Each structure stands twice: as C-alpha cells, then as structure tokens.
C-alpha cells in the first residue's frame, strides 16, 4: 500500500519575496502565491518573517481546500535554517487549523545550491 506520485510544495525564500508553488510530480503548476499578492499586506516592507509565514499559511489553507493528502516539501534559499523551519511549520498550520489533523507532509528536502565561483556579484552599497 505505497503510492508514488506525491504533490510537491516548493518554497523559495529569497530576500525580498517568498514564492510558494504547488506542483505535481512532473512540475506542472496548480496554484502559487507570493508575498505581494496576499489580500491583506499593503505595501511597505516584504523581507520580514511575517510575509514568509503568512504566505505559507495561505498556501496551506489553499492546499487543504483542494483535497490533497500527500505532499513533499522542497525548500530553497540563502538564509538561516530557523526561517525554513518556521515556514514549514506555518504550512502545516495552514493545512491543519489546530495542529491536530494528520500530517500531509511525507518528505522534507533542502535544494539550495551555491555557484562554484561563477559570475561576478555587483558592487557594495555605500549607504
């Protein structure tokens, strides 16, 4: 009683916007959310942890509403691990209201890669 094709939740956590995308096992996008596209956040600032875990909350509720039961979380970003852990538990919060319902997450992965001295990064900011 083992099934193969679980859905994928990609969570790219950049510096100024977090993207959460819900795909199938072949990469086809079913729904997506960004920091700037949330109904309540009105401009100003976007890099704080509140935008990240609010986007994770939103995608968790939207994924519960479409009746999915088996997801695989892939996390990407050049940040500390505390923010990725908080985003994952916020997605679980979005799926399950009181952290009582069963976990749809069956796998967690970090897919963050570094350039092997590739292109030259831009100049410093003398602020």
């Amino acid at each position: 009683n083992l099934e193969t094709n679980a859905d994928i939740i990609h969570i790219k956590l950049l510096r100024n916007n977090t993207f959460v995308t819900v795909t199938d096992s072949k990469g086809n996008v079913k729904c997506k959310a960004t920091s700037g596209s949330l109904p309540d956040l009105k401009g100003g600032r976007k890099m704080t942890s509140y935008t990240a875990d609010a986007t994770a909350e939103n995608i968790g509720r939207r994924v519960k509403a479409m009746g999915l039961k088996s997801v695989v979380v892939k996390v990407n970003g050049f940040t500390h691990f505390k923010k990725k852990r908080n985003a994952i538990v916020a997605f679980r919060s979005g799926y399950s209201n009181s952290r009582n319902d069963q976990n749809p997450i069956v796998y967690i992965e970090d897919t963050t890669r570094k350039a092997h001295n590739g292109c030259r990064l831009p100049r410093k900011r003398r602020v």
Binding site: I105, V106, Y107, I108, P122
Partner: protein, 75 residues
C-alpha cells in the same frame, strides 16, 4: 538533503534535517554566501581579523578547560 518523516512526527524530522545540514557543513557555506563583491585586498583583511578572533577564542577555551580540569579530577 532529504529526510523522511515517520508516523507524522514533523518536529523529529525537522530536527534531524537541521542536524544533518549542520554536520554536513552545508550550513557554514549557506551562511558564507555574499551579497556584494569583495576584492582580494579586502579578503586578506577579513581573513586576518578572523585569525585574530580565533586566537583569542583558543586562549579563552584553553584557560577555561585548564581551570575546569584542575578542580574536577580530585584536586
């Protein structure tokens, strides 16, 4: 680094993933990522400051461990 979760215990899986990202050394490299460009003439200065900080921490840990190990083993 992929971690399988067993019996729906997400906190154990996240702790295991954090510790594996720690012990594989990838957390050091993911924190060492730079936002801007630094020249070699500034890489030398930063490496020198790193070395001085390391030497100070080595002296601190040496003295602390010596005064711990004097008392703890029957003296």
């Amino acid at each position: 680094i992929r971690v399988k979760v067993f019996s729906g215990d997400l906190d154990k899986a996240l702790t295991i993933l954090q510790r594996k990202m720690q012990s594989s050394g990838m957390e050091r490299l993911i924190k060492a990522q730079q936002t801007h460009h630094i020249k070699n003439s500034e890489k030398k200065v930063l490496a020198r400051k790193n070395l001085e900080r390391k030497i100070k921490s080595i002296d601190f840990a040496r003295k602390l461990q010596s005064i711990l190990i004097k008392k703890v083993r029957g003296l």
